[PDB]
Amino acid sequence: YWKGERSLPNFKKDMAFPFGLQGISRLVYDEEKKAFCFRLYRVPFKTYLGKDFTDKRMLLERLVKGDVKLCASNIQLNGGKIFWLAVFEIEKEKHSLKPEVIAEASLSLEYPIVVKTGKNRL
DNA sequence: CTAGCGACTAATTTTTCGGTTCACGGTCCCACAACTAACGAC
After folding, report:
1. CA(A86)–C1'(B39) in Å?
2. Separation of CA A93 and C1' B1 in angstroms?
């Protein structure tokens, strides 16, 4: 900005507006309605996992019991539906990896990924 | 629970080869066609 190679941002109107973790409250699992309930600044909200009884199902419960950390999230609205962009802080996964073993990856427009690993081609 | 704060395409021309025309001093073997000399009938 001192030299000048960037214009001042002109924010759009459909922006997902941000809300901090200091606003999530009354998080519980109401079994009667089969949906998590919470308040986004004094308004009830039934969460629609739908047919997602495993993927993010044990993620909100990982927060109702205080086991996963959440960051300043955002919220989108796309014409009747409402979406929450929750920045959950997930951890790394440890496998049985060998640093000496090297995978040779190449990316081209004819073959998006071509990978060598010893005698294994993918 | 909320608020303050850290140049490419089409049209026209021209030319070599083919077509056409004129038209006087060995062997051995198995069949097939003659064929003829003799034989029998009228």
Report:
1. 143
2. 37
